[PDB]
Amino acid sequence: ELDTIQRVFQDQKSNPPLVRNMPPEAGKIIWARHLFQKITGPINIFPENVINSTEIRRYYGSYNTLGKQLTIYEMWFYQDWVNKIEQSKAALQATLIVRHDENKKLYVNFDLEIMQLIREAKCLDRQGIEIPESARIILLQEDKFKTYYNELLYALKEYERINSKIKPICKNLLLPHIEDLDLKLRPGMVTLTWTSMNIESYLYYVHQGLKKLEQLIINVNDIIENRIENNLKTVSKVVLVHLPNVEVERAVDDLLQTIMLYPLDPHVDPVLPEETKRIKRYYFWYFYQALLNSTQNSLNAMKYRVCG
């Protein structure tokens, strides 16, 4: 051994590589108790046988004298631990925990409270210790906060993926829809996760807005990404010299088809996004440049291969 035990204790619990899911407090006291038990066985063984011788015782012582020391260290650790959580909750963590909200991402206010209450009950149960009523009530509430924080996490990021897929094109039909997807939260709702409701419906409604937007994008795709691209390819293949009206008619039809998707050819008035609307016209001009270039590319091809 137990001088060997002594050197073990002198190298206290914070110094070795403990790997587990048990707090420093709990691991420290168990190791001390176990060490004391081992001691021891051886121481127881030684014684018786041885014682006687013683040696062882011485050783045882150392161990013990070691046993006395260990008991003293245990008591100091428990002095810092017994009653600590009750004081923390009753003073500054039990006072109507602000739920999780957002501005640019999800902002976690009481992350510490979640983690702490978590470790608290797991360790008190595993160690066969009594858990005060205050700790159990707030712990169940914490589980509610954690689940809602995670679900809101998923929601926010849904808006993020949709954004990652919209921003590469910067279409001024979805940019206004994106603008319309803005919401406002008053302070009276900053405490809804207490009785477990109105946040599920809120998140579901935000999701409903996102899915409706997604459906609009799906349409815009089916109308624009396939039919018009195929038409452009047809325009490029047209041999203007020889080959053994239609595309022009289809181009006109496709314009009107795009107009049917609520694209703001005039700037939206109340919003006044004069700068934002011309961006799609620039991309559309690039597409128009691709159409004229398609015919032009053909033009040059014939001009080069006229001799055969």
**253-267: burial string, b at 16+ Cβ within 10 Å, e else:** ebeeebeeeebbeee
Please answer whether residues 29 and 78 qualify as being in contact, where contact means their C-beta atoms are separated by less than 8 angstroms: yes
SS3 192: coil
- Position 201: which residue type? S
Q: According to the entry, how was the structure determined?
A: cryo-EM
How far separated are the first and last CA of the chain, in Å rounded?
102
Q: Count other C-beta atoms under 10 Å from residue 93's C-beta.
A: 17
Contacts of residue 137, defined as CB under 8 A and 6 or more positions apart, other chains included, come to: none
What does residue 107 show for φ and ψ, rounded to 5 degrees? -100, 120
What is d(CA 159, CA 167) in angstroms, rounded to the nearest whole number?
12
Contact 18, 27 (CB under 8 A): yes
> What distances in angstroms separate CA 183 from CA 102, 107, 147, 178, 209, one per listed residue?
11, 16, 22, 11, 11
Q: What is the resolution of this structure in A?
A: 8.8
List, as one string, the DSSP characters of 214-255: HHHHHHHHIIIIIIIHHHHHHHHH--SS----HHHHHHHHHH
